[PDB]
Amino acid sequence: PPGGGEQEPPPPPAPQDVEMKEEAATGGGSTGEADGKTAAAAAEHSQRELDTVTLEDIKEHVKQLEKAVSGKEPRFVLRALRMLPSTSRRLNHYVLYKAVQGFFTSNNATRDFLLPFLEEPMDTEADLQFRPRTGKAASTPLLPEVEAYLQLLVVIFMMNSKRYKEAQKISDDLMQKISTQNRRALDLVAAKCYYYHARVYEFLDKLDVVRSFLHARLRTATLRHDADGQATLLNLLLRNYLHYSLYDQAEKLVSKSVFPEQANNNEWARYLYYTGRIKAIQLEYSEARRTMTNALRKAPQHTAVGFKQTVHKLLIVVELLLGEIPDRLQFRQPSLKRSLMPYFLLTQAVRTGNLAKFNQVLDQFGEKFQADGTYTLIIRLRHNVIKTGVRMISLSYSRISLADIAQKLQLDSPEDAEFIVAKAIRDGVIEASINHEKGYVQSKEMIDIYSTREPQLAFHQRISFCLDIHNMSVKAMRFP
């Protein structure tokens, strides 16, 4: 008891400092950054806000609970106040409440007091200049609080932050003028709590009412604030719309646009994983392997944790349907390994041309196939076994009888033996010629050609268009 009682005081001072000065220096600094320059944006405290939010998402967040200075909620949410020279007095009132909190119990517990608190900024009337400061002062307690998952009486409080964000959405439909430089930070912050829309709604069932609401927000941002807005909202669309049918494959067709410019960073890569599974549902394997590889290869630096391992998991799925895959056991991480353990023997069965080896993988690992969600291609891969199996043996064997190859091709009658190779040439597999009497399959090859034209002529536009973009970057980054 004395140890646990005296170890309570040490923890709070760290949130009492960094959690106090995180939105004070970044938010209060963004106030001066929003008064002028305001180029672009930039508003570098918006990306610094991303660093602080992602910092809280690990440790320590804020709420909890935690029974440490719950008076931080009324601190920033009250006392604009009101015009800038009067706000300076309230800038001293934060220090006044620092002394009040340094004297008495400092209101270490709020809970049901969030009802007057969250409505106090509406009692001030008003900030009135910066809506992102009002939305952030209310959300910063509540957004990390969603990670508690208590599911009692505070879920509707998260919904109240969603209503405050809807007031941020109506103000996202009006001003401007003309030229809002704070709406990019509103795109950032709202995309977060739009994913908190996803989490809080997913506590019970699908959000479908918010699918028409997201389409209302996604379309009302057109065309003005779509920049960096439409990208995050399209992932908010694509993610759960990939979980719930339907039509998103043809919906993103008419939705594009592209939509440029890609922001922010890994956002477009993860979008190419989301739409990567989409474009993989059309089964064209050149665009699917390029969108899946570009999804993972374009994402630094992690941690955390396993969904960046999931894009790598589903990445080589289209490579399994290509007919040739390397053994990936050397790419296993300490985490991704234990997650894909069935998928290991799966791609090992894809390398081999044995049917029973692949079918036993299906019967045993079908439970993990339910966990991943990819099924339909597991039964049709038997056609990849007959095409890779015939690619194997044909190129392999000098002249193979249709009765001897019939074991690995499982039928290979005297009739279909013609089509196996012939319709493989239709798919561009093997050139083997067969004169059918008994018969026997005599595989030869003569090709000397290509390896030339498209690679070098495309490399011209590749390199040139690249260095042109690198011009568009460097030439435009010299403002300082």
Binding site: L50, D57, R239, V305, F307, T310
Partner: peptide, 24 residues
């Protein structure tokens, strides 16, 4: 990041090759 997506979730052979001789 931690932002965005990720926080959501013939043998060798020894014996058989030596046996091929004495098989036939």
């Amino acid at each position: 990041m931690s932002e965005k997506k990720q926080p959501v979730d013939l043998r060798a052979e020894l014996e058989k090759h030596g046996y091929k001789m004495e098989t036939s």
